[PDB]
Design an enzyme around this catalytic site. Structure first.
Site, PDB file in Angstrom:
ATOM      1  N   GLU A   1      -4.875  -2.369  -6.901  1.00 51.03           N
ATOM      2  CA  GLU A   1      -5.182  -3.151  -5.707  1.00 51.03           C
ATOM      3  C   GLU A   1      -5.995  -4.382  -6.065  1.00 51.03           C
ATOM      4  O   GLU A   1      -5.798  -5.452  -5.484  1.00 51.03           O
ATOM      5  CB  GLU A   1      -5.928  -2.311  -4.672  1.00 51.03           C
ATOM      6  CG  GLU A   1      -5.034  -1.460  -3.765  1.00 51.03           C
ATOM      7  CD  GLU A   1      -4.138  -2.283  -2.857  1.00 51.03           C
ATOM      8  OE1 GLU A   1      -4.472  -3.443  -2.536  1.00 51.03           O
ATOM      9  OE2 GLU A   1      -3.083  -1.769  -2.455  1.00 51.03           O
TER      10      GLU A   1
ATOM     11  N   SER B   1       0.802  -1.223   0.000  1.00 55.82           N
ATOM     12  CA  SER B   1       0.000   0.000   0.000  1.00 55.82           C
ATOM     13  C   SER B   1       0.835   1.273   0.000  1.00 55.82           C
ATOM     14  O   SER B   1       0.263   2.357  -0.109  1.00 55.82           O
ATOM     15  CB  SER B   1      -0.955   0.026   1.203  1.00 55.82           C
ATOM     16  OG  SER B   1      -2.092  -0.806   1.010  1.00 55.82           O
TER      17      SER B   1
HETATM   18  O1  LIG Z   1      -6.330  -0.096   6.501  1.00 54.42           O
HETATM   19  C1  LIG Z   1      -5.205   0.123   7.020  1.00 54.42           C
HETATM   20  O2  LIG Z   1      -5.119   0.828   8.071  1.00 54.42           O
HETATM   21  C2  LIG Z   1      -3.970  -0.492   6.346  1.00 54.42           C
HETATM   22  N1  LIG Z   1      -2.671  -0.382   6.746  1.00 54.42           N
HETATM   23  C3  LIG Z   1      -1.931  -1.067   5.875  1.00 54.42           C
HETATM   24  C4  LIG Z   1      -0.430  -1.232   5.931  1.00 54.42           C
HETATM   25  C5  LIG Z   1      -0.076  -2.217   7.046  1.00 54.42           C
HETATM   26  O3  LIG Z   1      -0.358  -1.580   8.283  1.00 54.42           O
HETATM   27  O4  LIG Z   1      -2.682  -1.589   4.963  1.00 54.42           O
HETATM   28  C6  LIG Z   1      -3.936  -1.276   5.181  1.00 54.42           C
HETATM   29  C7  LIG Z   1      -5.114  -1.725   4.326  1.00 54.42           C
HETATM   30  C8  LIG Z   1      -5.248  -3.250   4.391  1.00 54.42           C
HETATM   31  O5  LIG Z   1      -3.966  -3.826   4.416  1.00 54.42           O
HETATM   32  C1  LIG Z   2      -2.350  -2.133   1.278  1.00 45.19           C
HETATM   33  O1  LIG Z   2      -1.147  -2.250   2.008  1.00 45.19           O
HETATM   34  C2  LIG Z   2      -2.685  -3.524   0.702  1.00 45.19           C
HETATM   35  C3  LIG Z   2      -3.304  -4.450   1.419  1.00 45.19           C
HETATM   36  N1  LIG Z   2      -3.618  -5.791   0.908  1.00 45.19           N
HETATM   37  C4  LIG Z   2      -2.909  -6.455  -0.200  1.00 45.19           C
HETATM   38  C5  LIG Z   2      -3.031  -8.000  -0.219  1.00 45.19           C
HETATM   39  O2  LIG Z   2      -3.806  -8.564   0.480  1.00 45.19           O
HETATM   40  C6  LIG Z   2      -2.153  -8.861  -1.134  1.00 45.19           C
HETATM   41  C7  LIG Z   2      -1.226  -9.799  -0.341  1.00 45.19           C
HETATM   42  O3  LIG Z   2      -1.210 -11.073  -0.933  1.00 45.19           O
HETATM   43 NA    NA Z   3      -1.710   0.198   3.970  1.00 47.54          NA
END
Ligand SMILES: O=C(O)c1nc(CCO)oc1CCO
Ligand SMILES: *C(=O)/C=C/NCC(O)CC=O
Ligand code: NA
Ligand SMILES: O=C(O)[C@H]1/C(=C/CO)O[C@@H]2CC(=O)N21
Ligand SMILES: O=C(O)[C@H]1/C(=C\CO)O[C@@H]2CC(=O)N21
Ligand SMILES: [Cl-]
Ligand SMILES: [Cl-]
Length: 277
Positions: A146, A46
């Protein structure tokens, strides 16, 4: 020693960590530099939403489009079963959302659907790749929305970066070399006003330290491999100066909380070095 006992210190810490960790630090005001495990490609997850917001904000600046203009989002675009506070707020889609609101969700709350909406708006992942390359930052590959990353396991490894390329992008952005003043101010504030990664770059820093950042995270496969645990951004030092930093913990076998502690410890040791003038 000097900035070298610091690098050797971080390498020593990484010795027993079952993961491939990349590090890069760039002074903003002063010309300080640090690299650890640089000649490597780490999946961004992300974190590349930062690059996207740059491409979005640049398109607005250049075409003279207000960040307040509304975009119609079809319900088919608010995919389920992915992190998306936008879908949870507007579960029926078919709604006019301002670019401002979509940016906010994408950057401060890591909205996957917001991200893919904003890729559509700038003309796709390749358009973002060109925009970054044209800025004079090499070794960033941006190939997957994504939606495409949530399919096969391998697909996240095709959005990759070096740690150096990130700090170069961060410092270009921070020294206001990329955006208009209003766009700069807006993206910076969304990167400050986030609650994500409390235990990453911010974890061991003094209370009240300003940290503008963007996290990224992946799943763990059934052989116990977490592909990506990331945090990148700009930090304010007690004397008021700033440094850009990125830590990419890739292909880790470590437990999740160890993976964040790696980011926290590394950033903390960099914080301590720079706090001594
Ligand atoms: O929704 C959040 O707060 C979030 N943060 C991360 C980086 C890992 O902390 O990714 C996400 C979205 C799902 O992975
Ligand atoms: C933002 O960091 C992304 C979140 N999810 C990505 C995945 O789930 C892919 C991992 O296999
Ligand atoms: Na993220
Ligand atoms: O003088 C300082 O405050 C810090 C710094 C901060 C980054 O701009 O960069 C240089 C290297 C160091 O310790 N200095
Ligand atoms: O499937 C889609 O693409 C769109 C659409 C119209 C097609 O242009 O209507 C429904 C709302 C939604 O998400 N769908
Ligand atoms: Cl579409
Ligand atoms: Cl404190």
């Amino acid at each position: 020693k000097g900035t070298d006992s610091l690098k050797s210190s971080i390498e020593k810490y990484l010795k027993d960590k079952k993961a491939k960790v990349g590090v890069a630090v760039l002074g903003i005001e002063d010309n300080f530099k640090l690299n650890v495990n640089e000649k490597h490609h780490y999946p961004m997850q992300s974190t590349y939403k930062f690059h996207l917001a740059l491409a979005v904000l640049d398109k607005l600046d250049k075409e003279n489009i207000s960040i307040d203009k509304k975009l119609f989002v079809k319900k088919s675009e608010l995919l389920p079963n992915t992190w998306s506070p936008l879908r949870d707020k507007y579960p029926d889609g078919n709604v006019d959302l301002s670019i401002s609101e979509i940016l906010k969700a994408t950057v401060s709350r890591s909205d996957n659907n917001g991200c893919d909406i904003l890729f559509r708006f700038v003309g796709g992942t390749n358009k973002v790749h060109n925009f970054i390359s044209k800025l004079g930052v090499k070794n960033i590959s941006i190939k997957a929305t994504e939606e495409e990353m949530h399919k096969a396991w391998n697909v996240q490894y095709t959005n990759w970066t070096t740690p150096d390329a990130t700090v170069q992008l961060l410092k270009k952005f921070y020294k206001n070399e990329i955006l208009s003043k209003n766009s700069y101010d807006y993206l910076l504030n969304t990167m400050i006003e986030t609650t994500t990664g409390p235990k990453r770059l911010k974890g061991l820093l003094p209370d009240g330290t300003v940290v503008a950042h963007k996290t990224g995270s992946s799943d763990t496969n059934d052989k116990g491999i977490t592909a990506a645990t990331n945090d990148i951004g700009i930090i304010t030092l007690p004397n008021g100066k700033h440094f850009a930093i990125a830590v990419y913990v890739s292909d880790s076998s470590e437990k999740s909380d160890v993976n964040e502690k790696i980011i926290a410890e590394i950033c903390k040791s960099v914080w301590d070095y720079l706090v001594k003038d």
